[PDB]
């Protein structure tokens, strides 16, 4: 939020080709990357060094956002995109939803969409139709990551509620696209 | 091709400082990178996750394009740039031509220019004057890659015709620059 | 085979704790490693630089052998071990069989066992009970690799017959352990 | 522990040149390595694939053991060795102690020595005289790792007691060398 | 400098939030990256392949520039940013100054600012208040790098004068921001 | 040299199959590896952390030794092995000589053999018949490395004399094999 006195790239990427089923994700943090959190400055069209993760824990899945969306929290809709090889930071991928990881943090709701590329793009993930198809070990791994990664950030905490499905994820997209347009 | 109803960064990079001899290449896929094909969205100025290579085969040389060019196929002029270390995705390099790899695929002509940086930039490749100087093992390796990488993409095939020289490569550049301007 | 005139580590590792169901695999080539083939010198207890893969193609799965085995071909029983992260060259892993990839090359039979670590060691692969559970894309990828990797080795060729199951893989182990003892 | 019926490399490396002040550490898990736990088979002189870390968390410091030692737990004395670049698995380094990380797990005492190479070997760590010189962020990071890494291993838990100094670490070495000789 | 006849992204990033104390650095060359020098084309908003370092020596610290600055030499103000993990090329980081490395080369003054991220962003570097806190081995390493990296570039040389402090670094920023505005 | 009072793997690897033309090299430091010098403990059959290179400079070519050799300096014959991808530390490669890099250091002669794998093993280096075929940029790079890498080691220095050929390299091997046998 910029104040009245002062206020006197990425933003041109569409949210999706066929929302909410077919959406675009701009990658911020590749899976397994060294433990540095980058957050897109949507104005500037650049990735910003946001935090050196105090726990040194790495994202177990790629992390990114859907451009032209605004979730309640002030963030765009944030997305975890599962792939067999980490994606390049700052790249864009066409995606479909598997579901939602429901969480809350010290500041409020903190839900993350779970997504994969389209089947034609990534045949390796074609077998994942919904959140329930994601391997148990990987869902547990993703949950534990969110619960623990900010553990050494003063003031901060994260609690996971559980998972929800495709309908829940489409609602987040729908709402986020609506919010961004006012 | 965008339809009439709907149609109602990279594009500002010049094709070259002194065409067709001295041209610019924007890198899409670094040599030896994990087997994910990225293709520049010239409009958006971003690299797009295009395909997870079904064979898992990696590019043996850097892959990129000359901005502000349009080959017959709808692609910009595509270029293989040989370097002693892989180049950064999304970077640009001033280049000179060694020749052409002539190929056709299920969709039509599929020729790729072979290039190296300028000698001042990359003294390691100064000894490469023409395609014939490229080591045999590496030309065979590049040919085999193109013949096999799409082997597990349904509908797709690639056939290599052989190699051509600097004059042939300059013609591709000349023509591609001409086409892009109409 | 050493001649009479001249003949005048790894060998102390058991084939398995409970053969043929539970066997040990010493890793030679990690999945996704740079395209250099290493083969254990069982006498010397060292990995030997065997070949720079002419195609530059990388192993899509870890490659190793079961110590104290002798297949017909003169090799130990060779094994492909599937893991979510590449294993360290020269390490050993306790393994269970999924099946067999049946192949022949210019020199004769060329069958490879397909294996995973034990479930307690690697919960990520616990869902793989047999060869049929291995993702299609990965089996196709493994087949294509074996068909193509030696393509630029003069005199050499490899043909894949298809896959077989756990019973077939246990027979290879049983026989290989028997052969090694005479 | 091997039973009477059945019982009918690394072991030749000395514990240390000048114990307990100057000791040797054989590296098992490099700092920042992919999340696979290796444990030396002291008999066989090989690193064994022990566990795919369920949390996917990586060691923030190198992990190894002092050969020819036996701590109460059945393990050799285990050591965390801090270096500016990860060490090679299976290598050996001459080391000096900074202190001890005191912990207990479901099975009993679980103390880890904290060490660095000698100053001549590693001038980068010469400024670390005792555990207290280790950066706070890194000690917190190491503590959090041990508390959380086994979080998804059924039956397992780890509690950290706190840190102790050089005298405490020398006692662990002294005792461990004594135990190993009976 | 563009000539009159011809003259007929990054530039929109502010020099700093609170100059000269709080400034932004756009990263060009990550610490420890393969030995390829990239220099931002401030016009085009792209990283340009500038040189394959003839010595093959790698930057021991991240290298970047402060946008909207013009030092005497024609370059923006150039900055070395120290971090515990290399930063992504083309990313931006909010930074504070430690001091200056004073140098001259064949072409004139060649001073480099030394910086770290803000403490909240990077708690690992919070202990570095001034150039004097930077480990001796690392300052010697940085000096030796600048003295030697261009050793095999014909015509080129670099001499290091020594280090200066925070006041000197703020002057470079102040002046560089002033120059860029005319 | 061990004193009388105290004196009261690798060593079993032959120097070569057909000396001095065909010899074996055990790799200690891979090309381009992080700047940590490892030296084989020939007794123990392990790689030892020898030095964290004060300059942080990396070996531009693989570094290893010929087992069962003793050069004047007390070292085995040391060898630089050129390959298109770095070799695994602790592996062994069959090699042929290109020549010698003649050098002296504070302690005496300090000559290094220059070698490549056999042509069948590494077709990529088949074009290198003698030292003169090695690219100029790479010989300059290797020379500069040896001149500078120990620059920040107190007491130490290295001077390069120049290069010699295959006959000179065979003499070093011949002599080194002779010395090792007394």
From TrEMBL, chains A, B, C, D, E, F:
User: Where does it live in the cell?
Assistant: Cytoplasm
Protein name per Swiss-Prot or TrEMBL: Inorganic pyrophosphatase
Q: Which InterPro entries match?
A: Pyrophosphatase (IPR008162), Pyrophosphatase_sf (IPR036649)
MF GO annotations: inorganic diphosphate phosphatase activity; magnesium ion binding
Q: Where does substrate bind?
A: 37, 51, 63, 149
Q: Quaternary form?
A: Homohexamer.
UniProt-listed HAMAP family: Inorganic_PPase
Principal location = cytoplasm
Recorded E.C. number(s)? 3.6.1.1
User: What are its GO biological-process terms?
Assistant: phosphate-containing compound metabolic process
Q: Which UniProt keywords apply?
A: Cytoplasm, Hydrolase, Magnesium, Metal-binding
Domain of life the protein comes from: Bacteria
Specify which residues bind Mg(2+) 2 according to the UniProt entry for this protein: 78
Catalytic reaction annotation: diphosphate + H2O = 2 phosphate + H(+)
GO CC annotation terms, alphabetical: cytoplasm
Q: Which cofactor does it need?
A: Mg(2+)
Q: What does this protein do?
A: Catalyzes the hydrolysis of inorganic pyrophosphate (PPi) forming two phosphate ions.
Gene name? ppa
Q: Which residues bind Mg(2+) 1?
A: 73, 78, 110
A Pfam family for this UniProt protein?
Answer: Pyrophosphatase
What the record says about family reads:
Belongs to the PPase family.
């Amino acid at each position: 939020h910029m104040g009245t006195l002062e206020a006197q790239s990425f933003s041109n990427v569409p949210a999706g080709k066929d929302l909410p089923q077919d959406f675009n994700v701009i990658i911020e943090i590749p899976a397994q990357s060294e433990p540095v959190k980058y957050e897109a400055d949507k104005a500037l069209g650049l990735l910003v060094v946001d935090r050196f993760i105090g726990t040194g824990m790495r994202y177990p899945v790629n992390y990114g956002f859907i451009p032209q969306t605004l979730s309640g929290d002030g963030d765009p809709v944030d997305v975890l995109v599962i792939t067999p090889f980490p994606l390049l930071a700052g790249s864009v991928v066409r995606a479909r939803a598997l579901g939602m990881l429901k969480m809350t943090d010290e500041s409020g709701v903190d839900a993350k969409l779970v997504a994969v590329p389209h089947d034609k793009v990534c045949p390796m993930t074609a077998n994942l139709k919904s959140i329930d198809d994601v391997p148990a070990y990987l869902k547990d791994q993703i949950k534990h990551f969110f619960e623990q990664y900010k553990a050494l950030e003063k003031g901060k905490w994260v609690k996971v509620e559980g998972w929800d499905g495709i309908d829940a994820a489409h609602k987040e997209i729908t709402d986020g696209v609506a919010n961004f347009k006012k």
